[PDB]
Design a protein around this ligand. Structure first.
Ligand code: SOR
Ligand code: SOR
Ligand code: SOR
Ligand code: SOR
Ligand code: NI
Ligand code: NI
Ligand code: NI
Ligand code: NI
Ligand code: NI
Ligand code: NI
Ligand code: NI
Ligand code: NI
Ligand code: NI
Ligand code: NI
Ligand code: NI
Ligand code: NI
Lengths: 388, 388, 388, 388
């Protein structure tokens, strides 16, 4: 009846999303560049809550300290005129040829130091604009060949970089946290910290782990054929879901960055169900690319579609959970038992419990059906709005 | 000239590998069952160091405490007669219908308790036989549909199970460590802790993390299209590579379990180079399946091939690293710089270093070629034994 | 409001689908065997139109000519009592160990001859029961290693087999056509004629091409990451879609055989839209497996779900095409122009047409947006029943 | 001992390969543009036989008929000075924004006509330069969404385009054949005629099928997880392998275009074995991209590596086939029987042959091992130069 977004929904977009000119590895741009100020105004009209940026999206690379000031001021004025917020910022450590072998893990030491300085500079700006999260996507960290990169040394350099950024943030007294964005490949043959799991594990080896979280992207985990909602559940379980990138992907292939809802629709439904059920309160950020076949009217239609699909799925997931028939099916499938401790009675009690082994009727238990197909069809009926 | 394995190479095989009867989802067995005693004798003849087992491989499910004693005694006699060792053992929590929805994370609480008791029983046996590592492969932990499993609750149950096993081991004063074996899918649609990264991250949330490591399998990470050597490098970096399963896999599809060397040959080369360079001293365990097209002579030929390929790759990786031309190429590609700290001088020094940003010549640095293709061709020449 | 199937919908199921006992490569069966007579009765109750079978599903392998007669008679009586039809039949050339290296392309000549005799025998039975289509799924035709199979010779043997079957059918004056079912892998490492394209190309080299078509399966093309609806469109374009296997698959991994609607939901929508738009009049056959987690109530629920999902998607696809707003969007995206000939005026006229090259305004044409995102969102809104 | 290529080896390179500037979807170019004349000279020095080009690689888009003449003349002079040949040419129907929705299958009719005129113009030039094959890679033919393209209409337009090109070639009396290059995806979400199979099937529906063949690329079939050598075997079987694109790819992900030999090494070995065994006499064309990490010395090293790897594999494949031990193993695995007709005796004789069914000992046949693992290890030993 009404799927109109309002800033309360916390939907955000990166400047580079709706601003993508359409240049791909086999073709030239199909759209002219958008001035960040226009993007803010257009996104505000659509019901967006805010925007995000890479340093290089806002301030052209090589800009003087004076041109830099002018670009920030214009942007700040657009934010003030629209009420749009800037909850997240990041660094571009992948476009310029100097980062061809990476930023934080480039083999060249001078490049690694430059990467850190470029990042620190943008952290100051991020804080100025009010960002609460600083994302790091090591797109160029990795290799196409085995001897080019000693991964153990690379991880030492990656840890060193993140520890220094942590030391900087704490010495300046900033209220900002970091979020690592994993991706398995593209543009490098293999990228370091390829999935949410690898990123979470790496974080536990940092000096101040409390300052780091993860920024998973639906399409990235799907490029490894992984179950996105499951990955998000593990991140939440560890208390590390600081931010999230929403989009669509059609299986294992190049990173498509389709609008949210496109790609794996059922996974989108399960993702929304999880985010809403867990009470995730961070931004619902869309990192997508309106296909190069579109003109500007098509880009705004695509962006609007991102928000619309999230809202439709939110309604359907809510109806699913509130349905008494579904609550009954969840009990029939023993989801209630899954939430109860296996042995709150303790180890010794379990060892002495003859009902757990000596007298356990394995055949009777094995004959119990899980009733998962009925439950899944109810989920399907809810998603399609076909409940009879 | 000589690629003959000896027990010093630490090559091991699971009883279920060479003993696989050939039953697959579309066909009946093509080979008769092997008596574990024959397998030990045959493997000892081939130069193997030891064997591994699931409880159910050694003692048929449902066996009485007396039949259990006889099976262990026969096995023990074969080990004594051959000098074969048993460095690792594991539990079968996947074959019996009772584990259709998992063991440690089954929705049914009584099944979870049974899973733990079955495991504890085999841990005692493992220690008796001298195993240093106890592997856990949660093959049935997961789902085919989204509502069937609440992943956060499932992870709570998985943690609970592993913590209890840790409490047991420490209360008995055993000298045994655990290793979690990840797998992304099959037999479940999606399996919990799908990759080495997810497993490493989970371990950091256990009560006694020092007791747990990972047991990665080449084919499993490859089923997610991940770079196995990179994953192993991260495990070593974290000091968690307790054991390893070697085999072959041809890309993203069902788990093939080809003999080691088959599948991705170059990845096999890089894996061996890494294991030997890092000084991994654990067993080189083969978890493979001789294809159902083979008779018994073909199974022993396949097992022998596993060891032969490891030894050939070991020689080639050693020649590669010792080659002065390669050492020169490694420096040309700046691998030496990758190993040097980015900023041992500290944060403040980096911030004040004008050569790192203000006066950094980005164009000059960007113009430096990495020389990675030459290095990779030298690696190729070494692998193929074609160095001119 | 009403998604109840009736025999008019032409929904069919293989005996081996609802009859799958749940045995997978890592576990024993979780359900007892179903008597084909019970399956027919249960499927008739659900609204099914008919069933299909492999010879070995109906007559246990090794059965005497007398036991064979009894099995057929019982089955025939169930068909008569329910009004169920048998539109398709096939041969099991994959379960028995003798077919470990294939049937029609086994390296052993005696096995190939046996494969043909086994097939011919079942063709006679198929005709007797009224089947119009005879499917061939060469599940064991292929290899795990490169030297094991010379593919050119294998294709010669595959052609030889199919030509002989064609000669048999025509000499007996039967009214039956063949349909080749492609699959890229599993149970073999690589299967011959891996996709719909390969199968269509092979057919054009047979002696009587008019007798052969294809029987694509949604999950099989998806195991190669291919777009199923596109593949079906090519089959229809060539006039070769004789039959179709419907199910669900979650990307590139083992063949899941989920119920139809599960897996890639959007692809299911586009498939139904295409089948209904093209006027496909053959059976809507479900080749799926109710997950081993289910008891018998779960299998019937899963089968019912197959039909329900098809009917829901059919309604949504129909609403999409009938929507004036959609018809308007289709014109805005120039689908009408795609259907008009590029050069009905002829080659010479095109060469002399200056508006086609010399005076063609490429920049103006390039600036036209395709309006594909708006069209796709309308499709999404229709699928979810969210049209405002 | 000597892997130096000479023009007799027929190795060719596209101008766009060694000339790739390194621009990818996330970064700017890392190398300056190469003048085609320099590329010809450098490639001739390396032992190459010839080069190939897209119209737009040789003549900048938008060039006047006079600038066009100058570019061709300079190129012609470089060919004369080096003795380099031009065996293949193709059209660029993917870079310019006008082709954003395709060339031959664009929804806009005026674009389709323009695509044909652009192609015809380059065919004339190709003939002038002596090309025997004209390749067509429909990189933009396809879609990202289901409603954007009616595939049946698209195939009608694709057929119409190719038929017109055939009519043109025959009316001009040219001695040139066409080769369709399939690719499953990238840059479009899904590309029409996604694999070698689909392309072969489509060709059989053209007016003059004898004029069309296929130009498969190793990395493209691998992006669908298909077995390249198997696909090539089917193309040869149909007498349609007119040309071939050689490169390397690491599984299912974006198109990497690694140098030949890199990626799947074993598949490269089996490919060379097949091409040399079948007597393929066309060019060995490399369609690869030297990684953006390299400077110009790295690009020439990468190109040289393509040829070197082919020559090493050629030697190893030859040694494998000539090895008496291997010839013996091939007979043990019954490859000789695979080449013998299944029933040269005819249908009736087969039906009356009791040894084929009634008296066939299935158990005895089933017990015969295929000896495939031994054969494969011999292949492995040969590839690695480790034959004892
Ligand atoms: O694949 C590109 C990646 O998703 C990128 O867009 C990051 O999200 C961004 O650079 C960090 O915010
Ligand atoms: O895919 C099967 C898995 O690899 C299994 O064989 C484990 O390795 C074993 O159960 C634990 O040791
Ligand atoms: O992957 C199994 C395949 O789908 C099989 O079930 C065929 O459809 C059947 O044997 C022919 O009808
Ligand atoms: O993926 C790009 C494709 O391989 C292209 O390079 C073609 O080969 C060429 O355009 C035709 O010759
Ligand atoms: Ni992304
Ligand atoms: Ni992405
Ligand atoms: Ni992102
Ligand atoms: Ni395994
Ligand atoms: Ni495995
Ligand atoms: Ni394993
Ligand atoms: Ni199937
Ligand atoms: Ni299937
Ligand atoms: Ni099927
Ligand atoms: Ni290509
Ligand atoms: Ni390519
Ligand atoms: Ni190509």
């Amino acid at each position: 009846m009404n799927y109109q977004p309002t800033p309360e929904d916390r939907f955000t977009f990166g400047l580079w999303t709706v601003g993508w000119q359409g240049r791909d590895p086999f073709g030239d741009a199909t759209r002219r560049a958008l001035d960040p100020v226009e993007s803010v105004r257009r996104l505000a009209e659509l019901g967006a809550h805010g925007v995000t940026f890479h340093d290089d999206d806002l301030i052209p690379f090589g800009s003087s300290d004076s041109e830099r000031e002018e670009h920030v001021k214009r942007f700040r004025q657009a934010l003030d005129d629209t009420g749009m917020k800037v909850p997240m910022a990041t660094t571009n450590l992948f476009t310029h040829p100097v980062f061809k072998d990476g930023g934080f893990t480039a083999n060249d030491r001078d490049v690694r130091r430059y990467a850190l300085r470029k990042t620190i500079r943008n952290i100051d700006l991020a804080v100025e604009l009010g960002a609460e999260t600083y994302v790091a996507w090591g797109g160029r960290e990795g290799a196409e060949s085995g001897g080019a990169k000693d991964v153990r040394d690379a991880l030492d350099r990656m840890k060193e970089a993140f520890d220094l950024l942590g030391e900087y943030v704490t010495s300046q007294g900033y209220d900002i946290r970091f979020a690592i964005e994993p991706k398995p490949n593209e543009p490098r043959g293999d990228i370091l910290l390829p999935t949410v799991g690898h990123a979470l594990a790496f974080i536990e080896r940092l000096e101040r782990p409390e300052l780091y979280g993860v920024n998973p992207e639906v399409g990235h985990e799907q490029m490894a054929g992984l179950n996105f909602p499951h990955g998000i559940a593990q991140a939440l379980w560890a208390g590390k879901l600081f931010h999230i990138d929403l989009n669509g992907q059609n299986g294992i292939k190049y990173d498509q960055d389709l609008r949210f809802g496109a790609g794996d629709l059922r996974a989108a439904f399960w993702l929304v169900d999880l985010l809403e059920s867990a009470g995730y309160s961070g931004p619902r950020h869309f990192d997508f690319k309106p296909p190069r076949t579109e003109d500007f009217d098509g880009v705004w239609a695509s962006a609007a579609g991102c928000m619309r699909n999230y809202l439709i799925l939110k309604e359907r997931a809510a109806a699913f959970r509130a349905d008494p028939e579904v609550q009954e099916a969840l009990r029939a499938s023993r989801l209630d038992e899954l939430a109860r401790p296996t042995a709150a009675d303790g180890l010794q009690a379990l060892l002495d419990d003859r009902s757990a082994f000596e007298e356990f009727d394995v055949d009777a238990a094995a004959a119990r059906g899980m009733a998962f197909e009925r439950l899944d069809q109810l989920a399907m009926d809810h998603l399609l709005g076909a409940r009879g």
